[PDB]
Design a protein around this ligand. Structure first.
Ligand SMILES: */C=C\C(=O)N(c1ccc(-c2ccccc2)cc1)[C@@H](C(=O)N[C@@H](C)c1ccccc1)c1cccnc1
Ligand SMILES: */C=C\C(=O)N(c1ccc(-c2ccccc2)cc1)[C@H](C(=O)N[C@@H](C)c1ccccc1)c1cccnc1
Lengths: 302, 301
């Protein structure tokens, strides 16, 4: 019994973190086979943050300008390059601790584990959701950049995030490992705002099933409702629309608990409208949207 | 910026995790040097859960009655002794993945990272507090037993918890690695009442200092108070006493934020008396007591 924000074991990813340096600029990198990945803004200096030309800045520097320094060792650069917003620093020495890995671009609402690193040292691990506005509510300090988000699928590490920057609002923005930003963000010191942070409705329903499964089921109501009726309520409270896929994806939890999806939607409508009258669900004063239906099965079944 | 329930990288602990079978019963062990630690209740059937005798059950068993499996590998058991509520199985092989480690007994209000394990396989990692009533609100399913809690210090792992059982309330009971239960709990299937759990006052205070450090300043009032005046309100709302050591520990934060500990003490009292009014601090609509003053400093500096 019990239910917690659980990350994946960070072992396999600890052995992939490296320190990368260009002049005063020192940040984290990911070392997989004969390639080191980091954010391209390692080549930028405080003079060229307002409006950098990354092609042009890369020209200034060459293979030997990159201090790819791995746990007190040194690595030789055999051919750098630029993939959108990340550098592929080709090393001679392949990483012997390379897990079976894959690069994925995760959809908004999907969760992942972050290994927060400073100077290439695994510093801490926490679970995160890709917000609908393509930000993450993380925990990052200066030199965090290059810290990675990953999901472990058996023996296969699926890297989905590389941390780049914090926005004026204090939330965080990054890229897949092919260097494409999530959301409309760019790697320059400009006025950037995230859109409306809507609530991930399908995740909140997963978490309620999770609560029932623990025996914390006071909120269960004597009502029902419809997708259309529920969505009109959802929109008013800036909850993501609930689609039929999202009803189907909640299939397994509907099965065990014996409580239909719409009745769970019916119980959620009340809590949105009536608040929680000072009560709690799984020791939480508010509705948690940072657990996918997969995350709940994983933890409530093995 | 930003502030989260963070755990320590689990990698140095993953290499210490092993499976232990004895009869039908399977759980997790901790393989450090040539010793494998696990909960001693691995020797008990469904017929000896109410009231087992762990001396008259151990006696009946021998080295080869114990399967120790490290990943896909098998370990030769050449010894078995009982220390309080842990088994210590001597094996033919030093774990070459053994980190520099320590066994520490941890105090209530203290936090640690747990690596939840099933059949010797690291399944997940989360930060967890030793609660006043010596329970933990963890996440553990059948076969989670022998999963361990730990703090990490540069390269030196501090083992503090081993999980043993779930109480009929859903909260969890375990030992230090020397086999002594935190709290009055016993490894059998009897009526066992968790003490009434208080709030970890000093931790809530460090949480507010974190909030302030992120820019959340709305709960800061014009008032001040005293250790005694505050402690009176503390005991009232089932909050642990605040002590001078507690105030000393909070200094680094106090100095950083410019807010003297007794001023933050005053602000806390006004949230306790007035409630939070639907308002939120660091994304939380109730007061968080599961970050220590160390946890904040690590995460905020
Ligand atoms: C990894 C560095 C870092 O920690 N931050 C950061 C500094 C500078 C850049 C940058 C340099 C040159 C060209 C483009 C970008 C990127 C990241 C900071 C951070 O994100 N600061 C914000 C305000 C920033 C700086 C520059 C451009 C846009 C935005 C940071 C701070 C806290 C947590 N994570 C990162
Ligand atoms: C290690 C296996 C368990 O998960 N587990 C357990 C605890 C104690 C014994 C035992 C002790 C003394 C003598 C004989 C046997 C055996 C197994 C427990 C457990 O059994 N929990 C029960 C209370 C339970 C709760 C909720 C749902 C199903 C069962 C356990 C179970 C889950 C998490 N941690 C521990």
């Amino acid at each position: 019994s019990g239910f917690r924000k659980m990350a994946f074991p960070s072992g396999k990813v600890e052995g992939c973190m490296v320190q990368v340096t260009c002049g005063t600029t020192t940040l984290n990198g990911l070392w997989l086979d004969d390639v080191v990945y980091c954010p391209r803004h390692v080549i930028c200096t405080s003079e060229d943050m307002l409006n950098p030309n990354y092609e042009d800045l890369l020209i200034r520097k060459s293979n030997h300008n990159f201090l790819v320094q791995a746990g007190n060792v040194q690595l030789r650069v055999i051919g750098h390059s630029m993939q959108n917003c990340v550098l592929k620093l080709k090393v001679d020495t392949a990483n012997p601790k390379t897990p079976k890995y894959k690069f994925v671009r995760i959809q908004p609402g999907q969760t992942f584990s972050v290994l927060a690193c400073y100077n290439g040292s695994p510093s801490g691990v926490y679970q995160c959701a890709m917000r609908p506005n393509f930000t993450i509510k993380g925990s990052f300090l200066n030199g965090s950049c290059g810290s990675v988000g990953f999901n472990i699928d058996y023996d296969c590490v699926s890297f989905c995030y590389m941390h780049h920057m914090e926005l004026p609002t204090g939330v965080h923005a990054g890229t897949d490992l092919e260097g494409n930003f999530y959301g409309p963000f760019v790697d320059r010191q400009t006025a950037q705002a995230a859109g409306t942070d809507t609530t991930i409705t399908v995740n909140v329903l997963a978490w309620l099933y999770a609560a029932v499964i623990n025996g914390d089921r006071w909120f269960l109501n004597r009502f029902t409702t419809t997708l259309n009726d529920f969505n009109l309520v959802a929109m008013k409270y800036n909850y993501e629309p609930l689609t039929q896929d999202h009803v189907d994806i909640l299939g397994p939890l509907s099965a065990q608990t014996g409580i239909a999806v719409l009745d769970m939607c019916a119980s959620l409508k009340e809590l949105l409208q009536n608040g929680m009258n000072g009560r709690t669900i799984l020791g939480s004063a508010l509705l948690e949207d940072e657990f996918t239906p997969f995350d709940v099965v994983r933890q409530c079944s093995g």
